[PDB]
CSV table of C-alpha atoms in Angstrom, one decimal:
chain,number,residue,atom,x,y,z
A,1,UNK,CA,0.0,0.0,0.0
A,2,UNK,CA,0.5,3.5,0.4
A,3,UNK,CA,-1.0,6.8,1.4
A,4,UNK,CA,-2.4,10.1,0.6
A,5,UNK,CA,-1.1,13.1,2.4
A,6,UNK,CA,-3.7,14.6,4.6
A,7,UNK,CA,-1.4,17.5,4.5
A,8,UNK,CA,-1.5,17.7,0.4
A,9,UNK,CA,-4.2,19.6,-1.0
A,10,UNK,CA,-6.3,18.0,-3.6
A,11,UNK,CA,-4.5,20.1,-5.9
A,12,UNK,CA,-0.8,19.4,-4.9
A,13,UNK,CA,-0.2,22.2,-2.9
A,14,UNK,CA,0.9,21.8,0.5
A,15,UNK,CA,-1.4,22.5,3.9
A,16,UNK,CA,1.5,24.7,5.7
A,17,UNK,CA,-0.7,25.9,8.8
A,18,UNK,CA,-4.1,25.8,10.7
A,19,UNK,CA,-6.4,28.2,8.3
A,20,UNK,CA,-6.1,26.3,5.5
A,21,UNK,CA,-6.5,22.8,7.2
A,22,UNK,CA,-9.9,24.4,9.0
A,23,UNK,CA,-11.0,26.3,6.3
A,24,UNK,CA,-10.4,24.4,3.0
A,25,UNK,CA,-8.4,21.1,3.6
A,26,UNK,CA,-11.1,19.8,5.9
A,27,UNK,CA,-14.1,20.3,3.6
A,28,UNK,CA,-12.1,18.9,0.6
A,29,UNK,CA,-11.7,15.6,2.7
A,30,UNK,CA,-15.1,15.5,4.4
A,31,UNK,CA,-16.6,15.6,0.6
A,32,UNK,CA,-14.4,12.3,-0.3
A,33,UNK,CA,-15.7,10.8,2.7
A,34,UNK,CA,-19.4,11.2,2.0
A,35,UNK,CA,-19.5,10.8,-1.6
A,36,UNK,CA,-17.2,7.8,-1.5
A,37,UNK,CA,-17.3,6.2,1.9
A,38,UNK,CA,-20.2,6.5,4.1
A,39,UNK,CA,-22.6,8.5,1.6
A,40,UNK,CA,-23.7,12.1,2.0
A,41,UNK,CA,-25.5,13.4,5.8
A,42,UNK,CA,-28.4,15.2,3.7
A,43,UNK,CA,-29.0,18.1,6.3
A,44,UNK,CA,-27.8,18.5,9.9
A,45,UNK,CA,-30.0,19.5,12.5
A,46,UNK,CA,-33.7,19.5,11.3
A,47,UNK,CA,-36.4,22.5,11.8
A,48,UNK,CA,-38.6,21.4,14.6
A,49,UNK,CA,-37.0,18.9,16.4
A,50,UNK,CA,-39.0,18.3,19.5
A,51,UNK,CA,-37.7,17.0,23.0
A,52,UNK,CA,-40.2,15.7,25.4
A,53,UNK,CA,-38.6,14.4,28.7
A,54,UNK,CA,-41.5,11.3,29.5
A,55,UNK,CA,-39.6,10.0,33.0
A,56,UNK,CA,-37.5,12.1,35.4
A,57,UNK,CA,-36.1,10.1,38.6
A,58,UNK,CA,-33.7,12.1,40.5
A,59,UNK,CA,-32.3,8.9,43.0
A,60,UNK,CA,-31.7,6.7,40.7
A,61,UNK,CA,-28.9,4.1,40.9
A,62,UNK,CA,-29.3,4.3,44.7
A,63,UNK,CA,-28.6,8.3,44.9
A,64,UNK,CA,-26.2,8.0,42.7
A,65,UNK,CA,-27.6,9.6,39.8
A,66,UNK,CA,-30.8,11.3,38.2
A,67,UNK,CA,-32.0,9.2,35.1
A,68,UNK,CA,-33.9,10.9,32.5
A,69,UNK,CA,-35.6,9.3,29.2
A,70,UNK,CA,-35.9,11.7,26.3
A,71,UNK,CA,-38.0,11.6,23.2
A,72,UNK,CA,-35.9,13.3,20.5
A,73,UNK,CA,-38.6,13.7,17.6
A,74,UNK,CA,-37.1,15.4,14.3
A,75,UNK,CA,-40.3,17.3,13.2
A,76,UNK,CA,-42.5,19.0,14.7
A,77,UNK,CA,-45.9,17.3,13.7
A,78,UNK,CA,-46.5,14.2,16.1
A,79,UNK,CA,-45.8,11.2,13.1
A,80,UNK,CA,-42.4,12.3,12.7
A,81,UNK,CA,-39.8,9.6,13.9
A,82,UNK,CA,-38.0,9.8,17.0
A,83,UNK,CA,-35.2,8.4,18.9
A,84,UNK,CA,-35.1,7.6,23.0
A,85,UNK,CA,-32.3,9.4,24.8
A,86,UNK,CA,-31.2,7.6,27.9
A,87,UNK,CA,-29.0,9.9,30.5
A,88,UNK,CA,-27.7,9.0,33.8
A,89,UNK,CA,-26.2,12.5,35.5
A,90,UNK,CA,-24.1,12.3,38.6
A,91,UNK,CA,-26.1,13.7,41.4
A,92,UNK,CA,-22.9,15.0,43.0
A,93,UNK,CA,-22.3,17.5,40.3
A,94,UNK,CA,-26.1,18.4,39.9
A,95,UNK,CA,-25.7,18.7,43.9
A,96,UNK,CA,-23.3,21.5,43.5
A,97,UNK,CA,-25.2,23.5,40.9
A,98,UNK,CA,-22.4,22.5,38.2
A,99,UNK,CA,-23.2,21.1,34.9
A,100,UNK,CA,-21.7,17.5,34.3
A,101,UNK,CA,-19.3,16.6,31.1
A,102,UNK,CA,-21.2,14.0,29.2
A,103,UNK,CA,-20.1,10.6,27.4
A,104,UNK,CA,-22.6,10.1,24.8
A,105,UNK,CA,-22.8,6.7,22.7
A,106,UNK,CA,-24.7,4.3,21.0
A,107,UNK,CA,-26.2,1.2,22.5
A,108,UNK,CA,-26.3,-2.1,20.7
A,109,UNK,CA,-29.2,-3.8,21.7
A,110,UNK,CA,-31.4,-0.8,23.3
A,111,UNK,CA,-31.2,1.5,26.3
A,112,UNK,CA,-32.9,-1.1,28.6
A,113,UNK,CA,-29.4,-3.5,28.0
A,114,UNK,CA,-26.8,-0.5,29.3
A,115,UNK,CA,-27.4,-1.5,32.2
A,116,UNK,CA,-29.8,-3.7,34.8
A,117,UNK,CA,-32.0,-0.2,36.1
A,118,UNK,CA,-35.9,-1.8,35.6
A,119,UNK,CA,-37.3,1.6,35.4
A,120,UNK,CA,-35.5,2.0,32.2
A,121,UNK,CA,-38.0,1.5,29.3
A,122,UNK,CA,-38.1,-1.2,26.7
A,123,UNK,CA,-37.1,-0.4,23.3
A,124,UNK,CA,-40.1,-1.0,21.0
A,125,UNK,CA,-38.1,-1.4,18.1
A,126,UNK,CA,-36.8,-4.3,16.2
A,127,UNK,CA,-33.8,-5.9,18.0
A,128,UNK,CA,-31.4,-8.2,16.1
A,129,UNK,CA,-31.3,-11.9,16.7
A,130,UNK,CA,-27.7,-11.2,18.3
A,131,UNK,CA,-28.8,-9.4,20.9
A,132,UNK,CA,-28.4,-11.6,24.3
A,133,UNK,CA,-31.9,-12.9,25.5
A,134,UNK,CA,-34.6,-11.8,23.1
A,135,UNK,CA,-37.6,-12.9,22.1
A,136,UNK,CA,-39.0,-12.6,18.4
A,137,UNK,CA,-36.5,-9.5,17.4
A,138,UNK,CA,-38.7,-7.9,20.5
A,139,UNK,CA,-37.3,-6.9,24.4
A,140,UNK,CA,-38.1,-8.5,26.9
A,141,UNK,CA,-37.6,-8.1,30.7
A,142,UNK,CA,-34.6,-10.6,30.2
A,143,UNK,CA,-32.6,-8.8,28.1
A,144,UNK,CA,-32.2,-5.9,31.0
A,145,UNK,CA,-28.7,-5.4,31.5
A,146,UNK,CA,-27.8,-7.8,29.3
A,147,UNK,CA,-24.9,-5.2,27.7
A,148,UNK,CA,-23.8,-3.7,30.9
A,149,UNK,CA,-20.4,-5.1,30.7
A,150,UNK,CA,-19.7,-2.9,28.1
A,151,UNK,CA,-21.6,0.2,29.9
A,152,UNK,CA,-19.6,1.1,33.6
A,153,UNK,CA,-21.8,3.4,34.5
A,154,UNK,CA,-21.7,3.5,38.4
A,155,UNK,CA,-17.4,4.0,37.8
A,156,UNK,CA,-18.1,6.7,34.9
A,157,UNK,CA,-21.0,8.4,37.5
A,158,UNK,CA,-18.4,8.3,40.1
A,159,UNK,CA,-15.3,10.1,37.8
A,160,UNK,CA,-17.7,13.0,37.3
A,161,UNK,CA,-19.5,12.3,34.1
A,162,UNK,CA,-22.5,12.0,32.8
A,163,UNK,CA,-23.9,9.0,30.7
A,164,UNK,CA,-26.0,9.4,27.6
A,165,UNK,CA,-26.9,6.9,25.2
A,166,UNK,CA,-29.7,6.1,22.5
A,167,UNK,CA,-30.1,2.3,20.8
A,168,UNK,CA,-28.6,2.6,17.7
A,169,UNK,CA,-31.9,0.8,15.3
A,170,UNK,CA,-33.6,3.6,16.5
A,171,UNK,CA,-31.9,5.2,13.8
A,172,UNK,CA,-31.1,2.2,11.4
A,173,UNK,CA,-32.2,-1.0,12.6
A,174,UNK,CA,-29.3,-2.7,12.0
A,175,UNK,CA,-30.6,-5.5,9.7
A,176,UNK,CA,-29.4,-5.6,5.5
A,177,UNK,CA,-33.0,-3.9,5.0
A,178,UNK,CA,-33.0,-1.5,7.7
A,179,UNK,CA,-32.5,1.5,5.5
A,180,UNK,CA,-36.2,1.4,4.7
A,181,UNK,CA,-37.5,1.6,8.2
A,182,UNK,CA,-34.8,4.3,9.3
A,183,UNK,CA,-34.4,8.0,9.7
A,184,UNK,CA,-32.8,7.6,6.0
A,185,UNK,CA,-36.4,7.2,4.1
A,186,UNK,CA,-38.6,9.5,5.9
A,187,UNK,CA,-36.0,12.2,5.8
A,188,UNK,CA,-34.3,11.6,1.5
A,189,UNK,CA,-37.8,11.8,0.3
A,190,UNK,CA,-38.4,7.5,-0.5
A,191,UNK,CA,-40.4,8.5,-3.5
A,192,UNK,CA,-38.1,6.4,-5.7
A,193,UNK,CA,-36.3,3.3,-3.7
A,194,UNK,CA,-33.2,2.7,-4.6
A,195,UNK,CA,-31.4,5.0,-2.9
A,196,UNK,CA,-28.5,6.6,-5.1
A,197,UNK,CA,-24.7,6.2,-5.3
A,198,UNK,CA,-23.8,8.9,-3.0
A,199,UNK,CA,-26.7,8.3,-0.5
A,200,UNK,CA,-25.9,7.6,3.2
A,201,UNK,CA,-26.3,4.5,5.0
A,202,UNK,CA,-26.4,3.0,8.9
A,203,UNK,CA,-23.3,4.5,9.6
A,204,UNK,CA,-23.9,8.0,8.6
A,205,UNK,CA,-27.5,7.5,10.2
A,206,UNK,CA,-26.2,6.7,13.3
A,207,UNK,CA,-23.5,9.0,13.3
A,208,UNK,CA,-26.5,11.7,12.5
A,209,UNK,CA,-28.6,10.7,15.5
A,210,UNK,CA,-25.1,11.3,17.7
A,211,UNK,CA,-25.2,14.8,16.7
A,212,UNK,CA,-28.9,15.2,17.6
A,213,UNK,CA,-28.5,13.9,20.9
A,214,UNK,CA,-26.2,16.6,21.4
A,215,UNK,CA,-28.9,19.3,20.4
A,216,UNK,CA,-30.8,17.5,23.3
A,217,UNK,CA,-27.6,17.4,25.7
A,218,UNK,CA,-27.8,21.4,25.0
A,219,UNK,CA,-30.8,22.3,25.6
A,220,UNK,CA,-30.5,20.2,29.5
A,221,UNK,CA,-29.5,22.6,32.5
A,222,UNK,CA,-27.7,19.5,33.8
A,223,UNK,CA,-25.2,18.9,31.2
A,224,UNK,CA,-22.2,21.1,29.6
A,225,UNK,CA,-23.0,20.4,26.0
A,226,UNK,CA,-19.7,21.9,25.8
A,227,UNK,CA,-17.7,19.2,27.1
A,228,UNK,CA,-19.3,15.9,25.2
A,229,UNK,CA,-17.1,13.3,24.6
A,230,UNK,CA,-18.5,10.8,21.7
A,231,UNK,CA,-17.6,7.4,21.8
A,232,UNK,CA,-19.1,4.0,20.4
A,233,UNK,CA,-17.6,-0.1,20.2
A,234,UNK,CA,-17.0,-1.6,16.9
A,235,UNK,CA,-19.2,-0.2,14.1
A,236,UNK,CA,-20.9,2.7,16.7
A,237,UNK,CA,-16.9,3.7,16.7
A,238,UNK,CA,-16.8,3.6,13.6
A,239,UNK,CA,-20.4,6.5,13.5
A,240,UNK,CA,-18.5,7.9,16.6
A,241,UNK,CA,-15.7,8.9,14.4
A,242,UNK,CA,-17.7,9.8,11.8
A,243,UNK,CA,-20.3,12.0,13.9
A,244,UNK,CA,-16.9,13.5,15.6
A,245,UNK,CA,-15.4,14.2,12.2
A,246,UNK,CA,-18.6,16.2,10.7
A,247,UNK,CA,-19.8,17.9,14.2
A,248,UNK,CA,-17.0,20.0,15.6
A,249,UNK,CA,-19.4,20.7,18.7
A,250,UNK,CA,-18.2,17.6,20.1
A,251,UNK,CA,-15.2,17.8,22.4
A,252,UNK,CA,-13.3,14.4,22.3
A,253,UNK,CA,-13.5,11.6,20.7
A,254,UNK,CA,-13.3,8.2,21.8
A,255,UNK,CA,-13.3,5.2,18.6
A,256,UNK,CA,-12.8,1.8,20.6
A,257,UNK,CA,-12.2,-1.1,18.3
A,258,UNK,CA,-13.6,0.2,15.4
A,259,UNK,CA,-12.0,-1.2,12.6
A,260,UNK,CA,-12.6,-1.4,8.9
A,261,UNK,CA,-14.4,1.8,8.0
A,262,UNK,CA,-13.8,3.1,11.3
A,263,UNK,CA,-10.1,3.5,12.6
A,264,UNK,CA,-8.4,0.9,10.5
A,265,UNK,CA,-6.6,1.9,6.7
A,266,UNK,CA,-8.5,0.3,4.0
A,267,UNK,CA,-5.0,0.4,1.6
A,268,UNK,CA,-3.6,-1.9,4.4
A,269,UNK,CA,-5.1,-5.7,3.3
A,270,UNK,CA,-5.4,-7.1,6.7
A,271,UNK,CA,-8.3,-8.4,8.5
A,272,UNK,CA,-11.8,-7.5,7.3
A,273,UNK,CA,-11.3,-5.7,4.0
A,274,UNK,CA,-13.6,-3.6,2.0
A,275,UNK,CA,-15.1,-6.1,-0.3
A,276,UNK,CA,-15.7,-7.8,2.8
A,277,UNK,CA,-18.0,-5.4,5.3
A,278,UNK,CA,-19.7,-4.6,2.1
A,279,UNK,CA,-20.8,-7.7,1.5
A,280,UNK,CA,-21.8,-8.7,4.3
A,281,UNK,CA,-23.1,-5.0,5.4
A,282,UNK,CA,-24.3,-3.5,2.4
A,283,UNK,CA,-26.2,-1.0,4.0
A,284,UNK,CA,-23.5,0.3,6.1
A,285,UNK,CA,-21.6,2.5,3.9
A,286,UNK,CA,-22.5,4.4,0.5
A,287,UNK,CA,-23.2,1.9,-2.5
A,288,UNK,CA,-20.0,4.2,-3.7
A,289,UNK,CA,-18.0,2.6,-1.2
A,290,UNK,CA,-18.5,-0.9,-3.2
A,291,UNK,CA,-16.4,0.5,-6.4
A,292,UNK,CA,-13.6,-0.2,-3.7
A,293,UNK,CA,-14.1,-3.5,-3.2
A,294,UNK,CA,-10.9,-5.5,-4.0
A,295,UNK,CA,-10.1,-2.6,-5.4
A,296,UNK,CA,-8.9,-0.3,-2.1
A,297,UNK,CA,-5.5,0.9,-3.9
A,298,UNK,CA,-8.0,3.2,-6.0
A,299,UNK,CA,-9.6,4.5,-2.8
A,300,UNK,CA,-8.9,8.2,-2.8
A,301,UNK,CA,-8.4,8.9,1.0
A,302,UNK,CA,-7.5,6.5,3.8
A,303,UNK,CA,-9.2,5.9,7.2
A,304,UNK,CA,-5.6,8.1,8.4
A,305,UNK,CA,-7.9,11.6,6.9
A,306,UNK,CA,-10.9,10.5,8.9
A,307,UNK,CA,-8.9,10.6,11.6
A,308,UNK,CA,-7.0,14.0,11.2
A,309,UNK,CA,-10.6,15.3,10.8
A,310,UNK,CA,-10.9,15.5,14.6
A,311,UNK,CA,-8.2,17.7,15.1
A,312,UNK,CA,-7.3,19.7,17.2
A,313,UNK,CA,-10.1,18.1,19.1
A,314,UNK,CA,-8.6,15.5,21.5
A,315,UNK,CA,-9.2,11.7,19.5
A,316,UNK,CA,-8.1,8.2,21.8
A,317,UNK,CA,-8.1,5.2,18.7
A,318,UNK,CA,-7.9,1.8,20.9
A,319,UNK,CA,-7.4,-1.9,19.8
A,320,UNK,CA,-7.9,-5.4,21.4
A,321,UNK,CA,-4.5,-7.8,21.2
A,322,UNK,CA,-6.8,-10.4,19.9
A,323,UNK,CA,-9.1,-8.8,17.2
A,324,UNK,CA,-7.4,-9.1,14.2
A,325,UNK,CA,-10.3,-8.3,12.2
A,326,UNK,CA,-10.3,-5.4,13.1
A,327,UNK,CA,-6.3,-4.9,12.4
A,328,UNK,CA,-5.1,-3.2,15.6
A,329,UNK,CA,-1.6,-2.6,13.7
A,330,UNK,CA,-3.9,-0.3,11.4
A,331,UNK,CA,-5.6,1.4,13.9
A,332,UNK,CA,-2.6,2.2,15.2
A,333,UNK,CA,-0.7,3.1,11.5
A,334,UNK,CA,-4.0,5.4,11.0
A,335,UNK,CA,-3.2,7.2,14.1
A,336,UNK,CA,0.2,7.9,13.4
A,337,UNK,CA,-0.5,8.8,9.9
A,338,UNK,CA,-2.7,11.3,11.4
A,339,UNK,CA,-0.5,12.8,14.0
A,340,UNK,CA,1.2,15.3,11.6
A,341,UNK,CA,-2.1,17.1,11.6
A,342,UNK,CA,-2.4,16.8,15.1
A,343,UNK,CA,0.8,18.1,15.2
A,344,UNK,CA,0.3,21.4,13.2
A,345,UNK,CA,-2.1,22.1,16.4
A,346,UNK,CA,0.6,21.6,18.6
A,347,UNK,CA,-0.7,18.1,20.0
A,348,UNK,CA,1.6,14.7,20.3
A,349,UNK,CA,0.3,11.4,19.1
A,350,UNK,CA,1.8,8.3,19.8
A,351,UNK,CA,6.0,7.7,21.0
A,352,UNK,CA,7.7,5.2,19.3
A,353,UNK,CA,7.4,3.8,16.0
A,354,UNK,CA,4.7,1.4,15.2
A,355,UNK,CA,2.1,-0.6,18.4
A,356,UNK,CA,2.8,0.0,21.8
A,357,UNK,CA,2.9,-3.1,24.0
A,358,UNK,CA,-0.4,-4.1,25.9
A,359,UNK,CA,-2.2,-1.8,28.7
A,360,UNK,CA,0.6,1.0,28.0
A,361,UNK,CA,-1.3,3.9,26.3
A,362,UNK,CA,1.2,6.6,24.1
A,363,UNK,CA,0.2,9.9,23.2
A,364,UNK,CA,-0.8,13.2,24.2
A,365,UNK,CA,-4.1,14.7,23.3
A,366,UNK,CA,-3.9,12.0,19.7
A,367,UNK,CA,-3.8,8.4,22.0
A,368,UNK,CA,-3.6,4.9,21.7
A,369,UNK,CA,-3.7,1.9,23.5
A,370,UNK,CA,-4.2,-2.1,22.9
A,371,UNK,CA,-5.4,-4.2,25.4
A,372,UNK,CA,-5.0,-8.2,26.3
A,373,UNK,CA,-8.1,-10.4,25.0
A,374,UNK,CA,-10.7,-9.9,22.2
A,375,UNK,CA,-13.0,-7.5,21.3
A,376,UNK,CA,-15.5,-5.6,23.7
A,377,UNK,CA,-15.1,-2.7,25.4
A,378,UNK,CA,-13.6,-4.2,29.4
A,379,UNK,CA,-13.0,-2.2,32.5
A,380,UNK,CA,-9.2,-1.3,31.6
A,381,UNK,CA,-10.5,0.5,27.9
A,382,UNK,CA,-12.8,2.5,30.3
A,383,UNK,CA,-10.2,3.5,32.8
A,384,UNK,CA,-7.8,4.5,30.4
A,385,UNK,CA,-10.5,6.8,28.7
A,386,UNK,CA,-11.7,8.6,32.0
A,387,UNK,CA,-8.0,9.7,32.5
A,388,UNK,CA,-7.9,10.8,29.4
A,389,UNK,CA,-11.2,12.7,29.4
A,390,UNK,CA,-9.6,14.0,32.6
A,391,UNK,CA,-6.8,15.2,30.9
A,392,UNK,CA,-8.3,16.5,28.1
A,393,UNK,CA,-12.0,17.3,28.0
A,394,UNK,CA,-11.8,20.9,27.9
A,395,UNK,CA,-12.3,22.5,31.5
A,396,UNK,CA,-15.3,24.6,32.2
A,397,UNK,CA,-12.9,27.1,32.6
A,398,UNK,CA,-10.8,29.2,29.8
């Protein structure tokens, strides 16, 4: 393989300093990444978008925390779809009268699985055969809890933060026909059905709903919409990344395990490849990103450029020892092929020359780390990304 320069223009000349990265390099590479990768997010925020709080529990979690459940409609008139917002806020903070940083992600299997709460309402939605204990594609009282290994939320209430997160087939069941029943088809006007070339798919859906979860967390007197750090596990990193690349608003960015499409370069064959998550998740990604399959050395940017997008923005990329499909050693490359962008914002990336060894993250405000065992998203990922949202989630200060 071998890569494009996030640091060349499209037209050869050379980005020399922040103006130009902000101003006309970034746009350049956001356009290649919609028309050819993940299809084009037809409008941001949409007019009337309604929030309607429907429970409000202010001891949840034993004291711990107020829970609220949020109705994010996007239209104004009651038939428009909607997604449900569940947030968890640490009744410390609210005690002092301060606004909490949030981490805001998308959920698997639904809210109700993030963790064991029964007040927590029951998706309605399809839920995929995968999901632990369901019955008929439809929750049930089993499946409470049935994710919270991946959702620490008493240890993440304690640090400080607040916990948001919305089911991610709320947005794009995550099924090879979900398109049809997803925010995509009310919103691009499903008067024709094929949806074209350049039209987004799950990932830019979910990575959409991110960003309007955020014009909830805005609008809540508990929360510093300010200080928001995305994250999301496998492919919700890879929306994660994608919803931190488009929406500036969000401070930090957090892509665990994310892989092909996600953190991982394409141009590097290793582990799942792009003729590979296309066929097997054709409505992931653009029908444009199928010209690439097999075909990767013709791709015009690299997963590197997706990357450098955050900047200046603090980014953590982190791998699992054991998931090669996912190709740790390019989730790693990515970051350092990034890091010179990082760099012309006066930010470090990673020491040392290619992966570091296990449980030892590298890097300054740009970070990686790979941990023992397969994929997930374990206690040690989480530890290392509260002291980095410690670090680095801008203050609510200067």
């Amino acid at each position: 393989y071998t890569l494009p320069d996030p640091l060349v223009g499209a037209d050869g000349t050379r980005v020399h300093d922040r103006a130009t990265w902000q101003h006309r390099r970034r746009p350049e590479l956001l356009q290649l990444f919609a028309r050819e990768v993940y299809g084009r997010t037809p409008l941001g925020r949409p007019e009337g978008m309604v929030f309607k709080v429907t429970t409000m529990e202010h001891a949840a979690l034993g004291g711990a925390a107020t829970r609220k459940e949020v109705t994010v409609r996007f239209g104004r008139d009651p038939n428009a779809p909607s997604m449900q917002l569940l947030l968890y806020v640490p009744n410390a903070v609210i005690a002092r009268a301060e606004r909490a940083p949030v981490f805001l992600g998308l959920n698997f299997y639904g809210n109700h699985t993030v963790h064991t709460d029964p007040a927590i309402a029951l998706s309605a939605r399809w839920i995929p055969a995968e999901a632990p204990n369901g019955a008929n594609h439809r929750a049930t009282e089993a499946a409470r809890g049935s994710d919270a290994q991946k959702w620490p939320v008493e240890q993440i209430l304690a640090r400080g933060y607040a916990v948001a997160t919305v089911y991610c087939g709320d947005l794009c069941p995550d099924r090879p026909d979900g398109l049809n029943a997803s925010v995509a088809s009310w919103l691009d006007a499903a008067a024709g059905d094929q949806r074209a070339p350049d039209a987004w798919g799950a990932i830019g859906v979910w990575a959409w709903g991110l960003s309007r979860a955020l014009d909830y967390l805005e609008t809540d007197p508990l929360v510093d919409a300010s200080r928001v750090a995305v994250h999301g596990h496998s492919r919700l990193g890879k929306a994660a990344l994608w919803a931190g690349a488009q929406d500036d608003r969000f401070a930090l960015v957090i892509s665990n395990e994310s892989g092909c499409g996600g953190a991982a370069l394409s141009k590097r064959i290793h582990g799942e490849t792009v003729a590979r998550i296309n066929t097997v998740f054709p409505h992931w990604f653009a029908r444009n990103f199928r010209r690439y399959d097999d075909h990767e050395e013709a791709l015009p940017v690299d997963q590197h450029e997706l990357l450098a997008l955050v900047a200046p923005r603090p980014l953590y990329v982190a791998s699992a020892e054991d998931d090669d499909w996912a190709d740790p050693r390019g989730e790693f490359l990515a970051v350092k092929a990034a890091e010179p962008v990082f760099r012309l914002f006066g930010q470090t990336g990673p020491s040392g020359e290619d992966v570091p060894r296990v449980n030892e993250p590298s890097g300054g405000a740009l970070r990686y780390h790979i941990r023992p065992g397969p994929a997930g998203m374990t206690a040690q990922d989480w530890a290392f990304y509260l002291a980095f949202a410690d670090e680095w989630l801008k203050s609510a200060l200067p």
